[PDB]
Ligand binder design. Structure first.
Ligand SMILES: *[C@@H]1O[C@H](CO)[C@@H](O[C@@H]2O[C@H](CO)[C@@H](O)[C@H](O)[C@H]2NC(C)=O)[C@H](O)[C@H]1NC(C)=O
Ligand code: NAG
Ligand code: NAG
Ligand code: NAG
Lengths: 469, 463
């Protein structure tokens, strides 16, 4: 039609001059395709490899939730394991990865003759109530860690008698409890146990013998670094919770010195961050620093350990007539019969789950971030110099979303004063970075903020986030 | 004549290969994002199949009514005139097809390098080069012959069927293994909702992308033996199998793990394979690449037959619609499609362009349904050996209207830009066809270029 015809083409395209060009062009295409395929393999080979995951355990992936007094956790009505069964929904909402149950064995007094570890107190339920909790917890991916300290109703944690009988009954206790199905153990106040290093080695030996995913935690009241490192010379997978981070915090420089000097001393092993073995944060900090500290413990390289009520800022100093060793959790304003009417709208769990400005909302947002990003889970931690009273550090694993946390512990506002030439070139801070959340509400989120002229407010923490560069 | 050798099995394999592509390995995350719940996400996958079946019935009736080639475009051209037909051809050639081809090729390249870097993303240049290499190989094998293309399509359809059957069996084995804690009516609706608007618009518009391409068999006609019987049979057979495969594949995707793990992982298939097989899990991702390699061909086989039939009627430059003596294949048409797919590749992140193609292949599906409805009344004397009961075009029309209105409110900027892009082809129409008796400088140049391409590619013009 518009073009030439078949006969005209055959007369003009059958002669030499066209059959050569199309054959030459066909060869050129085939050479190019192989040239592209060879070029791709060159680029693939001359490319950096991707780093390998470190095969995390079940306690590397989130915080732990210590509960001391099961009776006071619910208050009245329910005071056994069956009472806790209905409250696992709240803990699952908190995105915790473990439960350090309080002692449950029948302990009467300092008499060791009838103090045994292999049966549960009648007030806490029985075996069928205990075991039903474990599998129900598994259905929610919640691990249960059983505490066992032979003397908790008295002033001495391990009696004033010898240590032979308590050790052998504790050894028999584990053999029973691993068969029961518990996912770990905890012992508190080991400084009252003679030569605790040897027994801890045996307990770690036996517990890890049953399985590789088991845990053992030890608690101490000492804050001296040399004393703390004394127990870790013979154990490598030991979680030690102590008062090292406590007894200070009025200045950010002291915390920076405490954290940095601890990590290089232990060689950047896996550690646990907690202000005390069995007491809340409010016993060591003013009411204005709970938001800042909960930001620090959820980004430091370890396994944060919290007591019950620390997500709502529960404090016994704001309510008269509350024992320091067993405060009652405030489900609502009717949970404390004594001096009624003093409980406000922000001192209840239900009074903070709908306000995106309360501690519980901040706890849940931080908890989700910790158990989601690879940088927070198993990323390297590097801290750099900053202004006076400023603590700043960066988390970065291989190439994932880098995080930047800046904390100002001072009571006066100042500039961040961030500087370069002190970080590895893999994750050098860029000119601008996104902001995820801030301790003090009032700022925007998602906008790329500048770091050269960044300003800070008293008792404020920032959680920035910048991409691979 | 081009050829008449495509049997029932070949047409059925064409439909399956066009439907089963990169959608099933990419969509299930997104449909689980906006829906929020497993049940509501499965609702989209089970209702899109019904909507596609209704459209397929309507298209089968319309295609047996009008035997002209180039379906979806001949019907509109005949009914609404030249202008609507040219607009549909312009949108299909420039928007629907190259974007789908680019997405399919990029998915192939990204999933074929998964074992090499199974903790991060591969370099972009290597992915682009691999995708261009497979595009060039497939366009060459399409320009070489048609029997080879059909055989390749059949083998790759068998391969996709085998891979999907293996996935369905692995997911099913948990009924005997007792791992059905998900989809348990106890948990069932694990989540309720979060917004208070029509966010389901961009969940249907993103889940009905694995269903794209069910109308493409109508493009390859005048190459089908006994089109009056084989085409409706293939259309009626293909869709139920696709729906049954897709629903159960989604069931297996949500049964082996938690919704969050789809909401974080970018390798939806790879996570399933590595969890339910552990070692020897390298088999499934390669098959996925194999699966995706069955899509590109199924596109280039039909795309070339569209731009062919779109140039005989003068809506496209005369240099196309070329027939090559010694194994007739539309060589310059195939080169044009390959190049058009390649130019898109210079712009990345076309996974955000799924909304583009999914909007456009709703507009030019409602338009054809409206054309069928108009022709049902205006010309009732046509011979229709296979007839569809009414109310199917009406139901598809009301659903179409609802999806358009609710998808034009959520994100208006990109949809408006796309509408402007498809509408600015009218000046091209006026300059090309409506304007005639041009100066000799136009005809002489056009004839010289056509003759040069003719001598280069060794073709003949059917006319
Ligand atoms: C940490 O615990 C140790 C051990 O209980 C405490 O050491 C006691 O110190 C008092 C004060 O001189 C002595 O009377 C006791 O005899 C010590 N205990 C033992 C077992 O010898 C130490 O005071 C505690 N530190 C803090 C800050 O509470
Ligand atoms: C630890 O257990 C192993 C396994 O039997 C044993 O050989 C070793 O002596 C144990 N060490 C201690 C300190 O109990
Ligand atoms: C930790 O202590 C060692 C030993 O003195 C020292 O070389 C190292 O620099 C310290 N770590 C840091 C971060 O300074
Ligand atoms: C929190 O409770 C205290 C206690 O009375 C009250 O003074 C304060 O206004 C409350 N804050 C908000 C935001 O309701």
């Amino acid at each position: 039609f518009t073009g030439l015809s078949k006969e005209e083409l055959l007369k003009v395209a059958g002669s030499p001059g066209w059959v050569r060009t199309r054959w030459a062009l066909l060869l050129l295409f085939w050479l190019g395709w192989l040239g592209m395929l060879a070029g791709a393999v060159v680029i693939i080979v001359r490319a950096p490899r991707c780093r390998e995951l470190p095969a995390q355990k079940w306690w590397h992936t989130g915080a732990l939730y210590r509960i001391g007094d099961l009776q006071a956790f619910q208050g009245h009505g329910a005071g056994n394991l069956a009472g806790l069964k209905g409250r696992l929904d709240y803990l699952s909402s908190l995105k915790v990865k473990g439960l350090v149950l309080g002692p449950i064995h029948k302990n009467q007094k300092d008499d060791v003759a009838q103090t045994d570890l292999l049966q549960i107190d009648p007030n806490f339920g029985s075996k069928e109530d205990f075991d039903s909790l474990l599998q129900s917890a598994k259905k929610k991916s919640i691990r249960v860690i059983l505490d066992l300290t032979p003397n908790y109703r008295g002033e001495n944690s391990w009696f004033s008698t010898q240590v032979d009988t308590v050790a052998t009954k504790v050894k028999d206790a584990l053999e029973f409890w691993l068969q029961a199905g518990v996912d770990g153990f905890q012992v508190r106040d080991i400084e009252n146990l003679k030569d605790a290093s040897s027994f801890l080695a045996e307990w770690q030996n036996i517990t890890k013998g049953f399985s590789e995913d088991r845990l053992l935690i030890a608690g101490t009241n000492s804050s001296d670094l040399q004393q703390i490192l004394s127990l870790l010379e013979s154990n490598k997978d030991l979680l030690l919770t102590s008062s090292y981070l406590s007894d200070s915090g009025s200045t950010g420089e002291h915390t920076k010195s405490l954290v940095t000097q601890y990590l290089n001393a232990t060689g950047n092993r896996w550690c646990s961050w907690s202000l005390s073995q069995a007491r809340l944060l409010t016993s060591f900090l003013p009411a204005q620093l709970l938001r800042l500290y909960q930001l620090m413990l959820f980004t430091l390289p370890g396994t944060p350990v919290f007591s019950y009520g620390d997500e709502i800022g529960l404090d016994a100093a704001a309510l008269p007539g509350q024992p320091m060793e067993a405060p009652v959790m405030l489900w609502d304003e009717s949970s404390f019969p004594d001096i009624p009417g003093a409980v406000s709208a922000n001192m209840t769990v239900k009074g903070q789950s709908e306000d995106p400005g309360s501690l519980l909302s901040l706890f849940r947002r931080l908890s989700d971030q910790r158990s989601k990003e690879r940088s927070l889970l198993h990323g390297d931690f590097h801290a750099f110099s900053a202004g006076p009273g400023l603590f700043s550090y960066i988390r970065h694993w291989d190439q994932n979303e880098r995080f930047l946390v800046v904390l100002n512990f001072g009571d006066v506002g100042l500039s961040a004063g961030l500087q370069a030439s002190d970080l590895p070139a893999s994750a050098s801070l860029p000119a601008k970075a996104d902001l995820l959340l801030s301790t003090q509400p009032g700022r925007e989120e998602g906008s790329p903020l500048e770091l050269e002229r960044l300003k800070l407010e008293p008792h404020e923490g920032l959680l920035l986030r910048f991409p691979y560069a | 004549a081009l050829k008449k050798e495509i049997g029932l099995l070949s047409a059925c394999t064409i439909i399956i290969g066009n439907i089963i592509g990169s959608g099933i390995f990419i969509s299930p995350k997104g449909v689980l994002e906006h829906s929020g719940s497993v049940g509501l996400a499965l609702f989209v996958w089970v209702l899109g199949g019904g909507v596609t079946a209704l459209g397929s019935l309507c298209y089968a009736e319309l295609g047996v009514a009008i035997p002209k080639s180039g379906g979806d475009y001949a019907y509109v051209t005949e009914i609404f005139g030249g202008l609507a037909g040219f607009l549909l051809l312009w949108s299909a050639v420039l928007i629907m097809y190259p974007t789908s081809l680019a997405v399919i090729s990029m998915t192939f390249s990204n999933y074929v390098l998964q074992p090499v870097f199974p903790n991060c993303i591969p370099p972009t240049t290597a992915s682009r080069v691999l995708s261009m290499a497979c595009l060039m190989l497939l366009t060459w094998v399409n320009s070489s012959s048609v029997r080879w293309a059909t055989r390749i399509q059949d083998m790759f359809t068998g391969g996709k069927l085998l891979a999907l059957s293996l996935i369905i069996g692995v997911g099913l084995l948990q009924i005997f293994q007792g791992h059905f804690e998900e989809l348990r009516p106890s948990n069932a609706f694990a989540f309720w909702m979060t917004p208070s608007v029509g966010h389901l618009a961009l969940a249907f518009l993103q889940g009905s992308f694995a269903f794209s391409g069910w109308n493409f068999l109508n493009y390859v006609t005048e190459e089908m033996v006994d089109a009056r019987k084989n085409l409706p049979r293939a259309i009626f057979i293909s869709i139920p199998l696709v729906t049954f495969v897709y629903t159960f594949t989604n069931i297996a995707y949500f049964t082996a793990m938690s919704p969050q793990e789809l909401l974080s992982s970018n390798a939806v298939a790879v996570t399933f394979g590595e969890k339910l097989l552990g070692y020897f899990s390298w088999v499934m991702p390669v098959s996925v690449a194999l699966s995706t390699f069955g899509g590109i061909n199924g596109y280039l086989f039909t795309y070339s037959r569209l731009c062919f039939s779109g140039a005989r009627e003068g809506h496209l430059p005369s240099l196309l619609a070329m027939i090559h003596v010694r194994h007739c294949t539309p060589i310059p048409a195939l080169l044009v499609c390959c190049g058009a797919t390649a130019v898109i590749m210079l712009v990345g992140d076309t996974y955000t362009l799924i909304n583009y193609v999914s909007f456009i292949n709703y507009l030019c599906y409602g338009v054809t349904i409206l054309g069928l409805l108009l022709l049902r009344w205006r010309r009732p004397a046509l011979h229709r050996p296979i007839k569809v009961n009414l109310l199917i075009p009406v139901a598809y029309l009301v659903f179409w209207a609802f999806l358009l209105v609710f998808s034009f409110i959520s994100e208006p900027m990109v949809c408006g830009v796309g509408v402007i892009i498809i509408l600015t082809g009218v000046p091209i129409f006026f300059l090309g066809v409506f304007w005639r008796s041009k100066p000799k400088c136009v005809h002489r140049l056009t004839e010289s270029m056509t003759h040069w391409g003719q001598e280069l590619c060794f073709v003949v013009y059917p006319q």
